[PDB]
Design a binder for this molecule. Structure first.
Ligand SMILES: [Mg+2]
Ligand SMILES: [Mg+2]
Ligand SMILES: [Mg+2]
Ligand SMILES: [Mg+2]
Ligand SMILES: [Mg+2]
Ligand SMILES: [Mg+2]
Lengths: 94, 130, 117, 94, 194
RNA sequence: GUAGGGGAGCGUUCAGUCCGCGGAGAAGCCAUACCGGAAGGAGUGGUGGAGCCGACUGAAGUGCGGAUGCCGGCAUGAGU
RNA sequence: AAAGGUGAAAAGAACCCCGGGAGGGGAGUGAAAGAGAACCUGAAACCGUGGACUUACAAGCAGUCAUGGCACCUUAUGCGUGUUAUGGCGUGCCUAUUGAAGCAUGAGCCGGCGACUUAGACCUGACGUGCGAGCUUAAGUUGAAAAACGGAGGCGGAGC
């Protein structure tokens, strides 16, 4: 019966209402209220001034199959490329 | 008694000595001044002071003082030699409005009030103590 | 869905208003002024509540030393001699004892005299 | 009465802050302070020679008071209710 | 281990969910369901933009005692609303295992009390609605309870029409709400059963 | 104890479920000396003339004294 | 631009009375006229009328405390409610501030409107549920008092 149906005990908390609070006038006091410009990255603070170039490629990437998986358990099912689908090595793309 | 529904149909609820002039274009504050001397006196006397009192407001108060005595005598079967003003009073009313003026802040300060009635009334009754 | 402020503000304000009685003029009539009066009213209420005990302290003393001075002691002397007898933790409200009961306070004065010299 | 009785009250039901042990007239006794009775008034330490008795009448809860606090400009307004419990002792004793 | 109306026995199949009858999961599920059915339609001209007003007003200085830009702002009367309802969705994907676990746990939540399975829905004889009242009465259903009938056989369910006794959820269209909401579940057709 | 963080909660609308109430009178409105740790909630009385509490869960256009804030009504100056 | 409401039904008030009228008072209809056409409720500001206790040597943020006087007894003869006389104490609220009773800001008064949201297969944390070395689907398809199907893809799974 849905009447008797209860909550998850701690799934939902109520939200945050800033109307009232009586001594809530939120955020800061001055200075950087009202803005949509906050933005935690940016130009010259230790991001630029940082001396890297390197060279970007990121080519062929192989799927890692551990020996530790293959030996020990299962059957030695004679893998090939076939069984890998069902052996929980299924990813592909590479 | 019974219940309220029944109390409503068991009694018609009359108004002895009561009559009221609604919506007279006049100022309540003003009419008050006339009406004050009338109050609590011999209804005849009341008609006389009302005869000789120089405010124009006095006139529709006079027209009413009678109409209430009128009701008092005919409707309530009262006795006019025992008659007197028990009470009278002035309650304001629906301050008069025309179509215009309508404009923000342009030559805009003026009256166009033409204040409300005061409503008059005067309940009349019989002397008691004599 | 939309929930207007209807029937809420009004009950609230009437609750506020109702505390106001002998409140003079707009204090008892207009809301904001009333509620506002009830802030300073808060201050005086609580603070002078803690105070009233200081006030009665004062009164009783003011009486006891009076009876004392009447009989030849004073509060300093009378309470000194009283305490000087481990006898009287009498202390509290002893005033009325001095006010209503003459011979009793005469006996307490004489006794407190013994406990001095 | 600092807390707990003293002195002289002839045959009077009165009030006192909570009496510990509950009872409907579970008997409560008190050693003395002063007495004007018998028309002979003798002070303390002769009142250890006397004890009044009292029967407990009822366990009550006093008249409600509100606790309101305010400090200006800082916000800070406070509202809390309070009732300070009691018991009523009927006085007849030696 | 539950008994059919006409013919054999079964229901010794289907171990019922563990732990037994968890109401939390039930809650998550139904809430998910009513949120699924929830149809967002919102009339708000929230934006100062959406209601109609020409936008330049009187003057920024020297008029005295106001300072307004437009007649369409939220702090005016008649303007837009600050943060009003728009046509959202709130339809999401509940993890499937919890759907399964849900209605399973529902059927199970009927194991602490009355539930019913059936075969032979031929006892209706067309529909006539009366023969359904007969079937119910002789099956113990006086319609003093609320009943969710789940069956195929269009004729058999078409027999039951009322909001009083029963409600009809065909061809295993089973809905955790729809069962948990009704008083008795009558599972009838043993198809999605067993 | 100020900005700020944390915890418990009160109230209003809609929604599902449960219990229900109403022409021998619903909501709202008005008075009140009771209850509750507070937001608050009851009792009886008076108006009213159709509807509406309570419990459980869910969703918010959800709580005003201020913004020379918005609309409306009504005061002051003054019988000037 | 503002904009709405008699009554179930016009049965919408003959007739009488004061009056040029407006307006009211009877009568009658009606459950109700405590619905009468300035026609649902009818709050608050604001204007009056009557009553109670009060006030014409008193310096005042309008209160708070304490005692007395007078009046009232439907949560209600006291644990009181209303008013008041005297005593004691007592620098509006808000913002803005090193600092506000401030001769600093705001605001005539009451009502109603009125401000920390919403969106994305975004990111990162707390708690909660389901499965768990695995976990999920997206578009869509099919049913649609109902939800199922859909492995394209995403995340773990190896680092440098
Ligand atoms: Mg600020
Ligand atoms: Mg700053
Ligand atoms: Mg503020
Ligand atoms: Mg002048
Ligand atoms: Mg002049
Ligand atoms: Mg009306």
């Amino acid at each position: 019966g849905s009447r008797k149906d209860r909550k998850r005990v701690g799934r939902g908390p109520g939200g945050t209402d800033k109307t009232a609070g009586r001594g809530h006038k939120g955020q800061k006091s001055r200075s950087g209220a009202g803005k949509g410009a906050f933005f935690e990255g940016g130009r010259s603070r230790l991001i630029a001034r940082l001396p890297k170039r390197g060279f970007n490629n990121v080519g062929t990437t192989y799927e890692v199959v551990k020996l530790s998986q293959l030996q020990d358990l299962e059957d030695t099912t004679f893998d090939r490329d076939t069984l890998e689908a069902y052996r929980l090595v299924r990813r592909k793309n590479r | 008694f019974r219940n309220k529904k029944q109390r409503k149909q068991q009694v018609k609820l009359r108004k002895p000595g009561f009559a009221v002039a609604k919506y007279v274009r006049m100022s309540p504050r003003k009419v008050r001044l006339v009406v004050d001397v009338i109050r609590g006196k011999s209804v005849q006397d009341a008609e006389d002071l009302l005869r000789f009192i120089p405010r124009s407001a006095s006139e529709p108060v006079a027209k009413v003082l009678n109409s209430a005595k009128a009701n008092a005598l005919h409707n309530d079967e009262m006795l006019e030699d025992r008659l007197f003003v028990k009470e009278a009073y002035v309650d304001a009313g629906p301050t008069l409005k025309r179509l215009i003026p309508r404009v923000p802040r342009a030559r805009g300060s003026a009256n166009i009030i033409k204040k409300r009635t005061s409503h008059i009334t005067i309940i009349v009754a019989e002397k008691g103590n004599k | 869905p939309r929930a207007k402020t209807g029937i809420v503000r009004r009950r609230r304000h009437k609750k506020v208003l109702k505390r106001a009685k002998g409140f003079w003029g707009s204090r008892s009539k207009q809301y904001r002024n009333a509620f506002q009066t009830l802030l300073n009213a808060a201050t005086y209420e609580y603070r002078d509540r803690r105070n009233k005990k200081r006030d009665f302290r004062r009164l009783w003393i003011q009486r006891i030393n009076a009876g004392a001075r009447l009989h030849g002691m004073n509060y300093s002397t009378f309470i000194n001699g009283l305490k000087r007898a481990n006898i009287d933790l009498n202390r509290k409200v002893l005033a009325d004892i001095a006010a209503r009961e003459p011979e009793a306070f005469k006996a307490l004065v004489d006794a407190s005299r013994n406990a001095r010299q | 009465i600092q807390t707990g009785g003293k002195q002289y009250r002839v045959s009077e039901g009165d009030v006192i802050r909570v009496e510990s042990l509950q009872g409907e007239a579970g008997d409560k006794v008190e050693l003395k302070a002063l007495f004007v009775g018998g028309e002979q008034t003798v002070f303390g330490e002769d009142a250890g020679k006397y004890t009044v008795q009292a029967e407990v009448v009822e366990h009550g809860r006093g008249k409600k008071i509100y606790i309101r606090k305010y400090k200006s400009g800082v916000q800070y307004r406070r509202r809390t209710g309070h009732r300070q419990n009691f018991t009523a002792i009927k006085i007849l004793g030696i | 281990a539950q008994i059919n109306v006409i013919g054999q026995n079964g229901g010794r199949t289907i171990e019922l969910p563990l732990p037994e009858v968890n109401s939390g999961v039930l809650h998550e599920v139904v809430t998910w369901q009513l949120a699924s059915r929830r149809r967002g339609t919102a009339s708000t001209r929230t934006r100062a933009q959406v209601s109609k007003t020409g936008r330049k007003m009187y003057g920024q200085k020297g008029t005295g005692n106001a300072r307004h830009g437009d007649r369409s702002v939220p702090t005016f009367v008649g303007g837009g609303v600050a943060f009003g309802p728009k046509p959202r969705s709130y339809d999401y994907t509940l993890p499937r295992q919890v759907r399964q676990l849900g209605l399973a746990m529902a059927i199970a939540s009927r194991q602490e009390g009355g539930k019913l399975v059936a075969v032979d829905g031929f006892d209706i004889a067309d529909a006539k609605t009366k023969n359904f009242i007969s079937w119910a009465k002789q099956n113990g259903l006086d319609g003093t309870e609320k009943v969710l009938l789940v069956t195929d056989d269009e004729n058999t369910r078409r027999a039951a029409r009322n909001v009083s006794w029963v409600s009809v959820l065909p061809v295993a269209g089973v809905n955790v709400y729809d069962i948990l909401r009704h008083d008795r579940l009558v599972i009838d057709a043993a198809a999605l059963e067993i």
